[PDB]
């Protein structure tokens, strides 16, 4: 255990005095496939390091003697945050990081940000799927051998979590009002932390 913790500390040291600049990337709601894609993209340009916030804070506090600059990075290790080190123009790495996104589908239970709508469209779905629409109260008619929503219908409202039937119909209709990707809280650069902006 302690050996693995020491290994993480040493790797953090390596990054801290091998990469002039880093980003503090927020990973809330970010999946693992997204993470692998991001690591693949930033490969060559940047490196990605995650850890336990307490681990990172204690490691830093113990390296502060040699590198007292990261004392200003210390108050930014909060929440689901990691470190993306780089030796490349800031803007490029920032753009790539906040460019890798995923329209995450509707998982039942998640608080829907904004009102989910279904529109009067020919969904191109096999008629058998009518069960889902009838369960959500979505009027439909079979045209050209495909399901077509007849009338606009607010599936769920802003606020109240997406129920299971709502989620099923949403995943059916590819409706996904969840966009997840790394955010950027701060950027450390040459002993100087500053907001992303």
């Amino acid at each position: 255990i302690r050996e693995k913790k020491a290994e993480y500390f040493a790797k953090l040291r390596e990054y801290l005095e091998e990469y002039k600049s880093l980003f503090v990337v927020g990973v809330d709601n970010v999946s693992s496939q997204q993470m692998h894609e991001v690591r693949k993209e930033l490969r060559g340009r940047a490196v990605v390091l995650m850890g336990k916030n307490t681990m990172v804070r204690r490691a830093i506090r113990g390296f502060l003697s040699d590198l007292p600059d990261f004392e200003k990075l210390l108050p930014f290790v909060k929440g689901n945050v990691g470190f993306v080190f780089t030796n490349e123009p800031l803007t490029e790495i920032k753009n790539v990081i906040v460019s890798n996104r995923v329209a995450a589908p509707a998982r039942a239970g998640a608080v829907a940000p904004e009102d989910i709508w279904v529109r009067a469209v020919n969904t191109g779905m096999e008629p058998g799927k009518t069960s889902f629409f009838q369960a959500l109260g979505v009027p439909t008619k079979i045209a050209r051998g495909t399901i077509e929503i007849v009338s606009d219908v607010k599936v769920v409202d802003a606020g109240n979590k997406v129920g299971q039937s709502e989620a099923s119909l949403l995943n059916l209709l590819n409706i996904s009002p969840f966009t997840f990707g790394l955010t950027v809280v701060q950027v450390y650069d040459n002993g100087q932390v500053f907001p992303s902006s």
Binding site: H36, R39, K40, R43, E126
Partner: protein, 158 residues
């Protein structure tokens, strides 16, 4: 022109049954016969070893394109005399595919893989071969991985 997208796993160089063809593709008005023939053509060299078959429905278009399936590639390289279902059940696989061949499979997988190095993708392919249980260069794929880890199998990273 709408790009529709569907897979199968029909056995290598084995005529695909219409009972396992029509349900998927049949909806968009294409003959299970012709698609099955396309699968056979795309799996000619793959004979015996199942593989994924990407099929793009571009306005009712039978564009069979075998997706490289790691295990399928591994065993087609194993080259074993055709695995005959009739002949014997539980056909085992022991193909001795050389390190170079495994690296070729790795370079045909790297594009659709995540391993940092070509060495890493070789490690992935060796793990697949270990799953298969076949012998490789008179040694286990796990020990090959141990060699790569300890810096013994200098990988031709290309």
């Amino acid at each position: 022109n709408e790009v529709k997208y569907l897979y199968l796993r029909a056995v290598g160089g084995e005529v695909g049954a219409s009972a396992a063809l029509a349900p998927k593709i049949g909806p968009l008005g294409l003959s299970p016969k012709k698609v099955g023939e396309d699968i056979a053509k795309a799996t000619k060299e793959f004979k015996g070893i199942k593989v994924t078959v990407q099929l793009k429905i571009q306005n009712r278009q039978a564009a069979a394109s075998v997706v490289p399936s790691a295990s399928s590639l591994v065993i087609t390289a194993l080259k074993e005399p055709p695995r005959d279902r009739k002949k014997d059940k539980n056909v085992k696989h022991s193909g001795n595919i050389q390190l170079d061949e495994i690296i070729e499979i790795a370079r045909q997988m790297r594009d659709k893989s995540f391993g940092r190095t070509l060495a890493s993708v070789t490690k992935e392919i060796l793990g697949t071969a270990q799953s298969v249980g076949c012998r490789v260069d008179f040694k286990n794929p796990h020990d090959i991985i141990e060699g790569i880890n300890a810096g013994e199998i200098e990988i031709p990273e290309n």
